[PDB]
Structures are given as structure tokens and as C-alpha cells.
């Protein structure tokens, strides 16, 4: 077990996590993130897993989401920064 | 275990997922979704009568997403967009 | 053996009595036509003891995810406040 | 041996004590007549108070507690807010 | 187990949790906290944001499945606080 995390933003919309297993914990926006909808999806086919917005819902708790690498996280919408936290087992 | 997901919207209000188990994880709205209440329900047949069970109510400006916990379903299961224009995304893990 | 379950509570039918079995709750959410006011659902048992488990409101918090709540029938769900409809979803396992 | 449990905290009754036994918390939610202000519930041990929830009628009327299992005795204190604030849980033994 | 908790604020932005495992339960703001975004991150250097709160938007958050092996430092990346973190020290 090793705490893990990544940041997605306008300039770096994608992050890839390349046995091993990643359990997600939270997704949250930076305080300087544009006040608009942010959507993070997992790409393998893309699957939206979270929709956040600073003035509406600044974060979300992920539960029971365990992924087998490799997995790519893409910022479908929003300027970010958007942080994803998890445990790399 | 295989990550799964579907989109429901005004055009396609229904998605029929057809030993297997589907564990739901999240429900979230698209950024272009109409700012109104969206309701997703699971539909099954009960006593020869249709029975739908609402599992989530979302709205862009109020609650753009929800985390589903402990919801494991045995196919076949139909997800219906009871209300809202969508798009509404449902994510889950399809384990077989 | 599991079976998806659910019920609606509203002004007209403020109560629903769910009559080895266990009911695991999953979510509580409001209908889109529900009055924009606070809705409170409570579980009622004889000890009469009622235990509030959720407070919702259309314009504030339209739904809630229930976790680790497993009940042994019989159990009654009562709409303490609000016009509804308020839906409760769960899994009835046996 | 599980038994649904619950208590109400308010301005006049800021404290409630839960006096092997285990209490698993499920939800915290405000009454519809609760003052539109921040409500904070904390667990107190001897003291040692630990805030576990911050609610407000017009902002966040309730919260789902997860994985919180307590060994009696435990005291719940309404650090702030008029209430009523309800705490639900499963008392097993 | 042993219930645990700490407060982070403008004047005490950091708290270090010095086999043992800390399971987090909730993060919530004090009623006197400045109405602005508060961000708490875990630091190991690698800092990992785990929560973004704001009094008038989202006053608290439930942490799930987050179990940590000491030592672990919690840092208030942003916000005046107070911000409370609750957990079970097993």
C-alpha cells in the first residue's frame, strides 16, 4: 500500500497509471479552479466517474473503485486543477 | 472485473445491461445537461407488473453527481432516465 | 438470494411497513415534483421509537447514499416531514 | 445481535451518552425546524473532543457516517447549533 | 481502536501522525472558519490533496477506505480553518 495522487488540468488533461491495484479515494478541485463543471473519466472507451464544480460540489468521495493498471484518467471538461487521490496496492 | 459505464439522455432514456454482477460506483451529469432534476431508476418486473426503483436524483446547479455504494446487481437490469435531459452517466464494475 | 427493493413515501402514504431476511438500504432521493421543503424520513420501531435517518430538500440536497444500514423486518419507514415523493431504494436479501 | 439506535441533540440537551458492545454510526441529520446555522457534533472522551460532522439546513442538511464503530461509553456533544440534530446508528452486542 | 482527531488552521497548518494504522472518517470545518476554500492534503516529497471544503458550499466530507501507516502529515494547503479531521487509530 502506497498513497497515490495526480493532478489534471487544462494543460495536462491526461494522466496514466501504468499484481498492482489502484483504489481511488477522493476527487477534489483546487481553490483556483475555474468556477465551471469539471468532469473526470477513465479511459480504456471512456467512462465518466465524477462531475465537480467549485461553487456547487468542490469534491467527491470515491468508494469501491479498484483498478488494474494500466488506466488513464482524462479531464473531459474543466480548467482544473483537479486532484485524484488513491492507494496504490 | 471490467470497468463499465453508460449514458442516458432524452434521446436514449433507457439502457438495458444484459455468474455476472454489476457493482455501481457513480452517477454524474454531463456539463451540457439541462439545469433541471434528473432521476435515474432501475426497472425490473414485479408480480407480472412493472416495478421501477429510483436510485438517484441529480441537478447540475444543486448536486452534479452521487457515489453509489453496495449496489450489486444481477443481469439483466434496465436503467431508465425517469426525468431530465441528460446526459447522465452511470459508472460501475462488471465482474464475471 | 437478493432482490432490488424500493418504496415511495408522500403526503398521502406517509408510511411504508416492510414486512432469515435483511433489508440493506442504498439511497433516498426526492421526486422532481416534490415540494421545495425539508423532507425527513425516519425508521419506526417499538421500544414507539422513531429514528431519523435522512433530511433532504430539492434545492439543497436532493438525495443521499445510505451505507451499512441493514435491517431485520419488520421495519416501518415514516415521512416525518415533507410532501414527497421520497424514494427509498435497497436490497432485500434472504 | 443488532438494534437500530438514535439520539437527538439540541440547544437544551447538548449532550447524549452511549453507556462486548459496539455502536456503528449511520447518519447525522437536522430537523426541519433547526436554526439555519452551522451545527457541529463531536465525540467526547476522557476530556478529548473530536468533531465528526458540520451541518447547516441551507447548505448540507445531513451526512452519511461510514466505518465509524465505537465502544461504549461514548458521549456525543452538540458543539454548535440549536438543533435538533439526529444521530442514527446500529447498536450491536 | 482509539478515536483520533486533529485541527488544522492558519496558525497550525500542519499536523503529523507519528503495527499502527489510521483510518480516516470525516473532515469538517469549524463554524467560525473563513468562507473560502479549504484544502487538506497528505504529505509524504509528495503532497496528495484529499479534500476541498468551503463553509457556504460543502462544510464537511466523509472519508472512506483511507487507511494510513504512520508517520503521515496532514497539511492545510488552503483556508484559514479550523478544519477538523477525525479517524480511528488502530
From Swiss-Prot, chain D:
Source species taxonomy: Eukaryota, Metazoa, Chordata, Craniata, Vertebrata
Protein name from the UniProt record: Nucleoplasmin
Superkingdom assignment: Eukaryota
UniProt organism field: Xenopus laevis (African clawed frog)
Family membership noted in the UniProt record: Belongs to the nucleoplasmin family.
Record-marked site positions (Interaction between pentamers): 36, 56
UniProt subunit comment: Homopentamer, when bound to H2A-H2B dimers only. Homodecamer of two stacked pentamers, when bound to H2A-H2B dimers and H3-H4 tetramers simultaneously. Interacts with the heterotetramer formed by wdr77 and prmt5.
Subcellular location(s) per record: Nucleus
Post-translational modification: Activated by phosphorylation of multiple serine/threonine residues, along both core and tail domains. The level of phosphorylation gradually increases during egg maturation, reaching an average of 7-10 phosphates per monomer, so that at the time of fertilization the activity of the protein is maximum.
UniProt function note: Acts as a chaperone for histones, such as histone H2A-H2B, and thus regulates the assembly of nucleosome cores. Involved in chromatin remodeling, especially during fertilization and early embryonic development. May be involved in sperm chromatin decondensation during fertilization.
Amino acid at each position: 500500500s502506497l498513497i497515490w495522487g495526480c493532478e489534471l488540468n487544462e494543460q495536462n488533461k491526461t494522466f496514466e497509471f501504468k499484481e498492482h491495484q489502484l483504489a481511488l479515494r477522493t476527487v477534489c478541485l483546487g481553490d483556483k479552479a475555474k468556477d465551471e463543471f469539471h468532469i473526470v473519466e477513465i479511459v480504456t472507451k471512456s467512462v465518466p466517474i465524477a462531475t465537480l464544480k467549485p461553487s456547487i460540489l468542490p469534491m467527491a468521495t470515491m468508494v469501491g473503485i479498484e483498478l488494474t493498471p494500466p488506466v488513464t484518467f482524462r479531464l473531459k471538461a474543466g480548467s482544473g486543477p483537479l486532484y485524484i487521490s488513491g492507494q496504490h496496492v
